[PDB]
Amino acid sequence: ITGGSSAVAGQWPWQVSITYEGVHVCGGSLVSEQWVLSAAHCFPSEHHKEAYEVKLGAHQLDSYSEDAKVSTLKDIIPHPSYLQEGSQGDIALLQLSRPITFSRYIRPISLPAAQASFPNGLHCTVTGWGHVAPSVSLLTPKPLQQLEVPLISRETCNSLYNIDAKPEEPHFVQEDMVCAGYVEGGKDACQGDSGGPLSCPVEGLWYLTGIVSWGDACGARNRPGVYTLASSYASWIQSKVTELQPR
Protein backbone atom coordinates (compact mmCIF):
# COMPACT_ATOMS: atom_id res chain seq x y z
CA ILE A 1 0.00 0.00 0.00
CA THR A 2 1.52 3.28 -1.00
CA GLY A 3 0.66 6.56 0.66
CA GLY A 4 -1.41 4.98 3.42
CA SER A 5 -0.67 4.59 7.13
CA SER A 6 0.00 1.79 9.61
CA ALA A 7 -3.13 0.06 10.89
CA VAL A 8 -3.17 -0.91 14.54
CA ALA A 9 -3.30 -4.56 15.71
CA GLY A 10 -6.87 -5.89 15.58
CA GLN A 11 -8.13 -3.08 13.36
CA TRP A 12 -8.80 -5.18 10.26
CA PRO A 13 -9.20 -8.65 11.79
CA TRP A 14 -10.32 -10.27 8.51
CA GLN A 15 -7.10 -9.37 6.73
CA VAL A 16 -4.90 -12.37 6.14
CA SER A 17 -1.50 -12.91 4.56
CA ILE A 18 -1.11 -15.57 1.95
CA THR A 19 2.39 -16.99 1.56
CA TYR A 20 3.85 -19.30 -1.06
CA GLU A 21 6.96 -21.22 -0.01
CA GLY A 22 7.14 -18.99 3.04
CA VAL A 23 7.04 -15.68 1.15
CA HIS A 24 4.10 -13.25 1.38
CA VAL A 25 2.54 -13.08 -2.09
CA CYS A 26 -1.02 -11.78 -1.58
CA GLY A 27 -3.64 -10.61 0.92
CA GLY A 28 -6.99 -12.32 1.55
CA SER A 29 -10.08 -11.84 3.70
CA LEU A 30 -11.41 -14.27 6.23
CA VAL A 31 -15.09 -14.89 5.62
CA SER A 32 -15.94 -17.73 7.99
CA GLU A 33 -14.17 -20.12 10.41
CA GLN A 34 -12.62 -22.09 7.57
CA TRP A 35 -12.88 -19.94 4.43
CA VAL A 36 -10.87 -17.10 2.96
CA LEU A 37 -11.46 -15.08 -0.18
CA SER A 38 -8.52 -13.89 -2.24
CA ALA A 39 -7.82 -13.26 -5.93
CA ALA A 40 -7.62 -16.06 -8.46
CA HIS A 41 -4.48 -14.63 -9.97
CA CYS A 42 -2.61 -15.36 -6.70
CA PHE A 43 -2.99 -19.10 -7.30
CA PRO A 44 -1.40 -20.05 -10.58
CA SER A 45 -1.93 -23.68 -11.64
CA GLU A 46 1.85 -24.36 -11.45
CA HIS A 47 1.93 -23.76 -7.72
CA HIS A 48 1.61 -26.61 -5.25
CA LYS A 49 -1.30 -26.34 -2.79
CA GLU A 50 0.85 -27.69 0.06
CA ALA A 51 3.30 -24.81 -0.33
CA TYR A 52 0.76 -22.15 0.64
CA GLU A 53 -0.04 -20.80 4.05
CA VAL A 54 -2.47 -18.27 5.37
CA LYS A 55 -1.53 -16.15 8.37
CA LEU A 56 -4.38 -14.71 10.37
CA GLY A 57 -4.42 -12.44 13.37
CA ALA A 58 -1.15 -10.84 12.21
CA HIS A 59 -0.41 -7.11 12.52
CA GLN A 60 3.35 -7.04 11.87
CA LEU A 61 4.24 -9.90 9.51
CA ASP A 62 7.80 -10.22 10.83
CA SER A 63 6.89 -10.09 14.51
CA TYR A 64 6.05 -13.06 16.64
CA SER A 65 2.59 -12.80 18.00
CA GLU A 66 0.68 -15.12 20.25
CA ASP A 67 -2.53 -13.91 18.58
CA ALA A 68 -1.61 -15.00 15.08
CA LYS A 69 -2.55 -18.35 13.64
CA VAL A 70 -0.98 -19.93 10.59
CA SER A 71 -2.80 -22.52 8.51
CA THR A 72 -2.29 -24.60 5.38
CA LEU A 73 -5.04 -24.89 2.74
CA LYS A 74 -7.33 -27.93 2.18
CA ASP A 75 -8.74 -26.50 -1.07
CA ILE A 76 -8.10 -23.63 -3.48
CA ILE A 77 -11.06 -22.77 -5.71
CA PRO A 78 -10.55 -20.05 -8.29
CA HIS A 79 -13.72 -18.96 -10.01
CA PRO A 80 -13.95 -20.98 -13.26
CA SER A 81 -14.23 -17.84 -15.43
CA TYR A 82 -10.80 -16.61 -14.48
CA LEU A 83 -8.90 -17.45 -17.68
CA GLN A 84 -5.91 -15.14 -17.76
CA GLU A 85 -4.39 -11.89 -16.50
CA GLY A 86 -6.88 -9.00 -16.49
CA SER A 87 -9.73 -11.55 -16.80
CA GLN A 88 -13.02 -11.33 -14.98
CA GLY A 89 -13.70 -13.82 -12.16
CA ASP A 90 -10.48 -12.81 -10.40
CA ILE A 91 -11.55 -14.32 -7.09
CA ALA A 92 -10.77 -17.54 -5.23
CA LEU A 93 -12.28 -19.35 -2.26
CA LEU A 94 -9.63 -20.94 -0.08
CA GLN A 95 -10.57 -23.52 2.50
CA LEU A 96 -8.17 -23.70 5.44
CA SER A 97 -6.95 -27.15 6.44
CA ARG A 98 -8.76 -26.84 9.74
CA PRO A 99 -11.28 -24.32 11.07
CA ILE A 100 -9.90 -21.50 13.17
CA THR A 101 -11.44 -19.96 16.27
CA PHE A 102 -12.43 -16.32 16.08
CA SER A 103 -10.76 -13.98 18.54
CA ARG A 104 -10.16 -10.29 19.09
CA TYR A 105 -7.63 -10.40 16.24
CA ILE A 106 -9.27 -12.92 13.88
CA ARG A 107 -12.80 -12.19 12.68
CA PRO A 108 -14.61 -12.63 9.43
CA ILE A 109 -15.89 -9.79 7.26
CA SER A 110 -19.52 -9.73 6.15
CA LEU A 111 -20.11 -10.40 2.46
CA PRO A 112 -22.46 -8.17 0.43
CA ALA A 113 -25.62 -9.42 -1.24
CA ALA A 114 -25.48 -9.96 -5.02
CA GLN A 115 -27.31 -6.63 -5.52
CA ALA A 116 -25.66 -4.56 -2.80
CA SER A 117 -24.60 -1.25 -4.31
CA PHE A 118 -21.76 0.67 -2.84
CA PRO A 119 -22.09 4.17 -4.21
CA ASN A 120 -19.50 6.10 -6.19
CA GLY A 121 -17.34 8.07 -3.84
CA LEU A 122 -17.92 5.91 -0.78
CA HIS A 123 -14.79 6.03 1.36
CA CYS A 124 -13.62 2.43 1.70
CA THR A 125 -10.31 1.16 2.96
CA VAL A 126 -7.83 -1.14 1.30
CA THR A 127 -5.28 -2.91 3.48
CA GLY A 128 -2.21 -5.02 2.86
CA TRP A 129 1.48 -5.71 3.38
CA GLY A 130 2.42 -5.02 -0.24
CA HIS A 131 5.04 -2.59 -1.43
CA VAL A 132 4.96 0.93 -0.04
CA ALA A 133 6.21 2.45 -3.38
CA PRO A 134 7.11 1.02 -6.78
CA SER A 135 9.56 -1.86 -6.23
CA VAL A 136 9.95 -0.79 -2.58
CA SER A 137 9.17 -3.41 0.06
CA LEU A 138 7.28 -2.61 3.27
CA LEU A 139 10.09 -2.42 5.80
CA THR A 140 10.33 -4.98 8.58
CA PRO A 141 8.56 -5.73 10.92
CA LYS A 142 5.87 -5.01 8.33
CA PRO A 143 2.88 -3.46 10.16
CA LEU A 144 -0.29 -3.81 8.09
CA GLN A 145 -0.86 -0.73 5.95
CA GLN A 146 -4.31 0.83 5.31
CA LEU A 147 -5.49 3.47 2.84
CA GLU A 148 -8.84 5.17 2.61
CA VAL A 149 -9.98 5.27 -1.01
CA PRO A 150 -13.19 6.56 -2.56
CA LEU A 151 -14.96 4.19 -4.90
CA ILE A 152 -14.63 5.04 -8.61
CA SER A 153 -17.12 3.53 -11.07
CA ARG A 154 -15.77 1.09 -13.60
CA GLU A 155 -16.77 3.56 -16.33
CA THR A 156 -14.72 6.38 -14.89
CA CYS A 157 -11.93 4.00 -14.16
CA ASN A 158 -11.83 2.76 -17.77
CA SER A 159 -11.55 6.38 -18.96
CA LEU A 160 -8.62 6.99 -16.63
CA TYR A 161 -6.84 3.82 -17.60
CA ASN A 162 -7.13 5.02 -21.23
CA ILE A 163 -5.06 8.11 -20.49
CA ASP A 164 -1.50 7.65 -21.78
CA ALA A 165 -2.31 3.99 -22.13
CA LYS A 166 0.08 1.55 -23.82
CA PRO A 167 -1.94 0.20 -26.77
CA GLU A 168 -0.66 -3.30 -26.16
CA GLU A 169 -0.99 -3.19 -22.40
CA PRO A 170 -4.74 -3.04 -21.85
CA HIS A 171 -6.49 -2.32 -18.63
CA PHE A 172 -10.18 -3.04 -19.03
CA VAL A 173 -12.25 -2.83 -15.89
CA GLN A 174 -14.72 -5.67 -16.31
CA GLU A 175 -18.39 -5.69 -15.33
CA ASP A 176 -17.54 -7.62 -12.13
CA MET A 177 -15.02 -4.96 -11.04
CA VAL A 178 -14.96 -1.54 -9.42
CA CYS A 179 -12.11 0.87 -8.82
CA ALA A 180 -11.08 2.97 -5.85
CA GLY A 181 -8.43 5.58 -5.29
CA TYR A 182 -7.34 8.93 -6.64
CA VAL A 183 -7.04 10.43 -10.07
CA GLU A 184 -3.86 12.26 -9.07
CA GLY A 185 -2.17 9.16 -7.76
CA GLY A 186 0.38 8.73 -4.97
CA LYS A 187 -2.06 6.58 -3.00
CA ASP A 188 -2.93 3.03 -4.00
CA ALA A 189 -2.34 -0.68 -3.49
CA CYS A 190 0.99 -2.12 -4.69
CA GLN A 191 2.47 -5.53 -5.48
CA GLY A 192 1.70 -7.85 -2.59
CA ASP A 193 -1.66 -6.22 -1.77
CA SER A 194 -3.68 -8.11 -4.37
CA GLY A 195 -6.21 -10.62 -3.10
CA GLY A 196 -6.76 -8.38 -0.08
CA PRO A 197 -9.94 -6.56 1.09
CA LEU A 198 -11.56 -3.36 0.07
CA SER A 199 -13.65 -2.87 3.20
CA CYS A 200 -16.55 -0.39 2.90
CA PRO A 201 -18.56 1.10 5.74
CA VAL A 202 -22.31 0.74 5.59
CA GLU A 203 -24.86 1.06 8.38
CA GLY A 204 -22.15 1.03 11.02
CA LEU A 205 -20.69 -2.25 9.75
CA TRP A 206 -17.93 -3.17 7.29
CA TYR A 207 -18.51 -5.20 4.15
CA LEU A 208 -16.12 -6.81 1.78
CA THR A 209 -16.96 -4.76 -1.27
CA GLY A 210 -13.91 -5.72 -3.25
CA ILE A 211 -10.87 -8.00 -3.58
CA VAL A 212 -7.74 -6.31 -4.95
CA SER A 213 -7.42 -7.52 -8.55
CA TRP A 214 -4.99 -5.13 -10.23
CA GLY A 215 -2.99 -4.14 -7.22
CA ASP A 216 0.17 -2.98 -8.99
CA ALA A 217 -0.87 0.58 -9.84
CA CYS A 218 1.20 1.71 -6.89
CA GLY A 219 0.37 5.36 -6.99
CA ALA A 220 0.59 6.04 -10.73
CA ARG A 221 -1.67 8.88 -11.82
CA ASN A 222 -4.81 7.82 -13.68
CA ARG A 223 -4.43 4.27 -12.46
CA PRO A 224 -6.72 3.66 -9.45
CA GLY A 225 -6.72 0.17 -7.90
CA VAL A 226 -9.13 -2.28 -9.58
CA TYR A 227 -11.12 -4.68 -7.42
CA THR A 228 -13.26 -7.69 -8.07
CA LEU A 229 -16.74 -7.04 -6.65
CA ALA A 230 -17.67 -9.54 -3.98
CA SER A 231 -21.30 -8.83 -4.81
CA SER A 232 -20.69 -10.29 -8.28
CA TYR A 233 -19.76 -13.58 -6.57
CA ALA A 234 -22.16 -13.62 -3.59
CA SER A 235 -24.30 -16.34 -5.19
CA TRP A 236 -21.31 -18.50 -6.22
CA ILE A 237 -19.56 -18.11 -2.87
CA GLN A 238 -22.76 -19.03 -1.08
CA SER A 239 -23.36 -22.02 -3.36
CA LYS A 240 -19.77 -23.42 -3.07
CA VAL A 241 -19.52 -22.99 0.71
CA THR A 242 -23.00 -24.36 1.40
CA GLU A 243 -22.41 -27.42 -0.71
CA LEU A 244 -18.86 -28.03 0.48
CA GLN A 245 -19.21 -27.16 4.14
CA PRO A 246 -22.77 -26.52 5.28
CA ARG A 247 -23.36 -25.07 8.72
UniProtKB/Swiss-Prot annotation:
Gene Ontology biological process terms from the UniProt entry: positive regulation of sodium ion transport; proteolysis
Tissue spec. comment: Found in prostate, liver, salivary gland, kidney, lung, pancreas, colon, bronchus and renal proximal tubular cells. In the prostate gland it may be synthesized in epithelial cells, secreted into the ducts, and excreted into the seminal fluid.
Oligomeric form and interacting partners: Heterodimer of two chains, light and heavy, held by a disulfide bond.
Protein name: Prostasin
GO MF entries: serine-type endopeptidase activity; serine-type peptidase activity
Domain Peptidase S1: from-to ranges: 1-242
Entry annotated with the keyword Transmembrane helix: yes
Active site (UniProt): 41 (charge relay system), 90 (charge relay system), 194 (charge relay system)
GO cellular component: extracellular exosome; extracellular region; extracellular space; plasma membrane
Family assignment from sequence similarity: Belongs to the peptidase S1 family.
EC number, as in UniProt: 3.4.21.-
Residues listed as glycosylation sites in the UniProt record: 115
Claim: Repeat is one of the keywords in the record: no
Phylogenetic lineage: Eukaryota, Metazoa, Chordata, Craniata, Vertebrata
Biological role stated in the UniProt entry: Possesses a trypsin-like cleavage specificity with a preference for poly-basic substrates. Stimulates epithelial sodium channel (ENaC) activity through activating cleavage of the gamma subunits (SCNN1G).
Disulfides per UniProt: 26-42, 124-200, 157-179, 190-218
Keywords associated with the record: Cell membrane, Disulfide bond, Glycoprotein, Hydrolase, Membrane, Protease, Secreted, Serine protease, Signal, Transmembrane, Transmembrane helix, Zymogen
Portion of the full sequence shown: 45 to 291 of 343
